[PDB]
Amino acid sequence: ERDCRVSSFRVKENFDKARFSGTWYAMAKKDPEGLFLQDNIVAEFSVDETGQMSATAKGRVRLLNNWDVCADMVGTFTDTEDPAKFKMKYWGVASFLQKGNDDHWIVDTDYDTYAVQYSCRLLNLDGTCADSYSFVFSRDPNGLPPEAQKIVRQRQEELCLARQYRLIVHNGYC
Numbered sequence: 001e002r003d004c005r006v007s008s009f010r011v012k013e014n015f016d017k018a019r020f021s022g023t024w025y026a027m028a029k030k031d032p033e034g035l036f037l038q039d040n041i042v043a044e045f046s047v048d049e050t051g052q053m054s055a056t057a058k059g060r061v062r063l064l065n066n067w068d069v070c071a072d073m074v075g076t077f078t079d080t081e082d083p084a085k086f087k088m089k090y091w092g093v094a095s096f097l098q099k100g101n102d103d104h105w106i107v108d109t110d111y112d113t114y115a116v117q118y119s120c121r122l123l124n125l126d127g128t129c130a131d132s133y134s135f136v137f138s139r140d141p142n143g144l145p146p147e148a149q150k151i152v153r154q155r156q157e158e159l160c161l162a163r164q165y166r167l168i169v170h171n172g173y174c
């Protein structure tokens, strides 16, 4: 008995696109199904003149334990009536050829310290999420202050994802 229905998750009240800009380092990850960035994950969010928020995403993958390649993406967030909620068109540009549409939600952040991003791709009949990913973002790759830790641990819980995040390696490999 703990509402895991996606339609009832709180996102970030009054999300300030532009404050959210600059570099963010993923430090922990909840994975979706199939292929995905594995580590050395780094996001670069920006907003152009109009208010269009877009971002790039750079990280490492392993395909068949034969290859270690640096994937490289670009996303563009269309808006919605929730400022914390977006539709994200993303694609590859390097080696990477895929295109996709994922929901992009900022669940909580303070633009200076940390950020919790989240994305459901599949709803079960009962409303819960069937396939989701989520990133613990940090402005400083050496970690989050004690206050941000407490909030991330709250949100992960509120997203019915606690304990399903694994930490992310960063070692210049890309």
Ligand SMILES: O=C(O)c1ccccc1NC(=O)N1CCC(c2ccccc2C(F)(F)F)CC1
Residues within 6 Å of the ligand: 034, 035, 036, 037, 043, 055, 056, 057, 061, 071, 073, 074, 075, 076, 088, 090, 091, 098, 100, 102, 104
């Ligand atoms: O989704 C797949 O099918 C996939 C397959 C193989 C390799 C990687 C994959 N996908 C991802 O790794 N990601 C994480 C990055 C994310 C992205 C891309 C561009 C700009 C911002 C973001 C952000 F919103 F996640 F930050 C797109 C989904």
